[PDB]
Amino acid sequence: SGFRKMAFPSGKVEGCMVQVTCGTTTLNGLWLDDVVYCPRHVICTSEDMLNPNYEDLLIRKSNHNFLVQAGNVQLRVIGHSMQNCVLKLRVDTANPKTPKYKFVRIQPGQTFSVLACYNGSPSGVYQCAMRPNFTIKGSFLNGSCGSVGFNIDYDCVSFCYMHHMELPTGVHAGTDLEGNFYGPFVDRQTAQAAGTDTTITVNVLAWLYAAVINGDRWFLNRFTTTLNDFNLVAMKYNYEPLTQDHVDILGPLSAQTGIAVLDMCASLKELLQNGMNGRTILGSALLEDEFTPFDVVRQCSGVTF
Amino acid sequence: SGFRKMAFPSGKVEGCMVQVTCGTTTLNGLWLDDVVYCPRHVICTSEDMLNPNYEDLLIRKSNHNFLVQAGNVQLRVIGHSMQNCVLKLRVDTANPKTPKYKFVRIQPGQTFSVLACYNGSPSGVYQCAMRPNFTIKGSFLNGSCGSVGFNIDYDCVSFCYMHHMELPTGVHAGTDLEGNFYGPFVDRQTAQAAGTDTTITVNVLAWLYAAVINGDRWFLNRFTTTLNDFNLVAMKYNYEPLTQDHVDILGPLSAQTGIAVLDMCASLKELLQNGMNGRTILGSALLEDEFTPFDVVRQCSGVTF
Numbered sequence: 001s002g003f004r005k006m007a008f009p010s011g012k013v014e015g016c017m018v019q020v021t022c023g024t025t026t027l028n029g030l031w032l033d034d035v036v037y038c039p040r041h042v043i044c045t046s047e048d049m050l051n052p053n054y055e056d057l058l059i060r061k062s063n064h065n066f067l068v069q070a071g072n073v074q075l076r077v078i079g080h081s082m083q084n085c086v087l088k089l090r091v092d093t094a095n096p097k098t099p100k101y102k103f104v105r106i107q108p109g110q111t112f113s114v115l116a117c118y119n120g121s122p123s124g125v126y127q128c129a130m131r132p133n134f135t136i137k138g139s140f141l142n143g144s145c146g147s148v149g150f151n152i153d154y155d156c157v158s159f160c161y162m163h164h165m166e167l168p169t170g171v172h173a174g175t176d177l178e179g180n181f182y183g184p185f186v187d188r189q190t191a192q193a194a195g196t197d198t199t200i201t202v203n204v205l206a207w208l209y210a211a212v213i214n215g216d217r218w219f220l221n222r223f224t225t226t227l228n229d230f231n232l233v234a235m236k237y238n239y240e241p242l243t244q245d246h247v248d249i250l251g252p253l254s255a256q257t258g259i260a261v262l263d264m265c266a267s268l269k270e271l272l273q274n275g276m277n278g279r280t281i282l283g284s285a286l287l288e289d290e291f292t293p294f295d296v297v298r299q300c301s302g303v304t305f
Numbered sequence: 306s307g308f309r310k311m312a313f314p315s316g317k318v319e320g321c322m323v324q325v326t327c328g329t330t331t332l333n334g335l336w337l338d339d340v341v342y343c344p345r346h347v348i349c350t351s352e353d354m355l356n357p358n359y360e361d362l363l364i365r366k367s368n369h370n371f372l373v374q375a376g377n378v379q380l381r382v383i384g385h386s387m388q389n390c391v392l393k394l395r396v397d398t399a400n401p402k403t404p405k406y407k408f409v410r411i412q413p414g415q416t417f418s419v420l421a422c423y424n425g426s427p428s429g430v431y432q433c434a435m436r437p438n439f440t441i442k443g444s445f446l447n448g449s450c451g452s453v454g455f456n457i458d459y460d461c462v463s464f465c466y467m468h469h470m471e472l473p474t475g476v477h478a479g480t481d482l483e484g485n486f487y488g489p490f491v492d493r494q495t496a497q498a499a500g501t502d503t504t505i506t507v508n509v510l511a512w513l514y515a516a517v518i519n520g521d522r523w524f525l526n527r528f529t530t531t532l533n534d535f536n537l538v539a540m541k542y543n544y545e546p547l548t549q550d551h552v553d554i555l556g557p558l559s560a561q562t563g564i565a566v567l568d569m570c571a572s573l574k575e576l577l578q579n580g581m582n583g584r585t586i587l588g589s590a591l592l593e594d595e596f597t598p599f600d601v602v603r604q605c606s607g608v609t610f
């Protein structure tokens with residue numbers, strides 16, 4: 001019993017974190033095989049970042065301009081190229097600690113662990129959801145860029161995020177491992193706005209099932225609702241519309257508890273309309289939307305790696 | 306910016322986890338040097354746990370009765386001894402992945418990372434605080450016993466917890482690596498309840514400094530209180546008494562922000578008596594007490610390991 005925000009064990013990702021320096025700019029890189037992937041703004045100075053032309057900045061750079069440090073060891077960069085907002089550095093050797101991996105582009109609502117690093121060294125690990133407005137609510141300081149987000153499926157590390165920047169409202173933005181930004185953001189030091197953030201509805205229901213499995217059941221009612229009737233109510237509260245696909249994803253949790261998805265929606269509707277009245281759910285006074293249906297199943301059935 | 310509950314990178318602890326089976330009872334062990342530490346109830350059958358005579362049960366157990374598995378390799382147990390509630394199985398092979406380590410007993414209020422395991426394999430990582438009632442709010446299932454709590458001091462791993470049991474309200478209990486339980490709990494399936502919990506006041510104040518550091522400054526007021534006047538209000542709300550040692554520990558946070566501890570106490574008093582007025586602090590509608598002042602400093606400085 002008990003329910004916590006839980007990150008994947010990070011040992012496999014730790015063995016891939018290196019330090020990338022270009023001039024006086026230092027950040028992190030991800031060493032897999034003989035390639036190191038890092039944000040392309042490692043080539044900028046403080047002034048370049050206001051309006052960079054990465055193409056010309058990179059032309060003025062050659063192999064001896066990039067220092068890659070793995071532990072106490074310098075890695076010889078024997079090639080470089082630019083793929084979207086990510087820089088690929090060909091190094092003299094393959095990472096002996098390279099795990100089985102893939103690069104994936106995640107959907108909004110999906111979660112991943114972030115291994116926050118500074119100077120190629122791991123500082124901490126925390127769980128993050130890709131918000132519907134394509135930002136994450138993380139914890140990143142100067143030099144954190146290059147820190148990656150990932151998921152583990154038994155032995156395989158699926159990398160999905162690389163940190164690049166922080167937006168005005170304290171939220172964070174970055175790219176997939178191909179350099180494509182999540183959202184309408186650019187790697188330029190200029191005011192940019194993230195859209196209005198909505199609540200991931202399928203995730204709130206998933207967390208309500210986790211609360212039920214843990215014995216937190218005060219919010220359950222003997223009422224029912226239709227999918228349309230629930231959506232008409234929830235949308236006034238800035239909740240994402242719930243679809244038949246989302247109900248199919250909630251199925252294993254529904255079957256395990258014996259509470260139909262639309263029965264749980266009637267409890268969620270009541271919580272939005274009447275509030276929580278000083279009560280808590282899994283120790284929280286707000287409805288939590290950063291656990292996916294899979295995160296609940298994984299935690300409640302002890303999936304190991 | 307951004308303040309998140311963060312666990313230590315788990316790589317170092319991952320390499321120390323093994324599986325320990327005795328008869329039909331299977332759980333996790335911690336392999337350091339040529340010794341495997343695990344909870345002593347691994348020798349118990351399902352009926353023994355109601356009223357176990359450990360001294361007697363262990364006398365009827367031999368080295369050959371303990372199966373220890375490190376990956377696909379079975380380790381030969383060449384000796385054993387019972388230290389309080391922990392079993393120490395001497396194996397014929399030192400763990401080549403043994404990091405620099407120490408065993409410590411933590412105090413209530415101090416935090417640690419839990420690497421949760423099943424069958425000797427890591428499933429996830431999260432941060433916990435030793436509550437004033439000596440329980441922890443974790444997430445553990447059947448077979449999670451022997452999973453450990455740890456802190457990392459750059460290169461040294463301080464092991465401070467080993468999971469043994471779960472109490473009625475979904476809260477957990479365990480021992481230090483000497484087998485001594487935190488709290489008044491015993492390792493027997495008998496009626497036990499955690500004493501009424503209190504809020505860790507120094508951790509709440511450290512969390513408000515983290516809020517000011519990140520921009521949430523709405524709760525700051527012109528008022529100032531004494532230590533005595535603060536403590537008379539905290540006790541009403543079930544808060545731990547704030548001592549001069551707690552005030553001294555808060556010193557680095559107070560100096561970085563230029564806000565006196567007793568000026569932050571007036572902010573906390575106002576918050577306890579009159580509420581949060583519909584506002585959040587660091588994305589939370591409740592006052593968080595699981596970040597110690599060292600966690601706030603570590604995260605806000607980007608300390609690496």
Ligand SMILES: *C(=N)[C@H](C[C@@H]1CCNC1=O)NC(=O)[C@@H]1[C@@H]2[C@H](CN1C(=O)[C@@H](NC(=O)C(F)(F)F)C(C)(C)C)C2(C)C
Pocket residue numbers: 027041049140141142143144145146163164165166167168172186187188189190191192306
């Ligand atoms: C990479 N190490 C940092 C990480 C930032 C620093 C503070 N916390 C973070 O997440 N990335 C940057 O410094 C990027 C980088 C230039 C400026 N920058 C920003 O994150 C800035 N943000 C923006 O200009 C905005 F709002 F558009 F996102 C900053 C104001 C410094 C937070 C580049 C090339 C975008």
Ligand SMILES: *C(=N)[C@H](C[C@@H]1CCNC1=O)NC(=O)[C@@H]1[C@@H]2[C@H](CN1C(=O)[C@@H](NC(=O)C(F)(F)F)C(C)(C)C)C2(C)C
Pocket residue numbers: 001332346354445446447448449450451468469470471472473477491492493494495496497
């Ligand atoms: C270790 N593998 C498990 C972890 C438990 C199982 C359910 N969730 C957990 O955290 N430990 C146990 O099964 C221990 C073990 C016997 C009984 N047990 C308990 O934790 C039980 N609790 C109590 O006896 C109580 F109420 F006193 F705290 C249980 C009812 C199974 C939760 C021993 C030797 C204590």
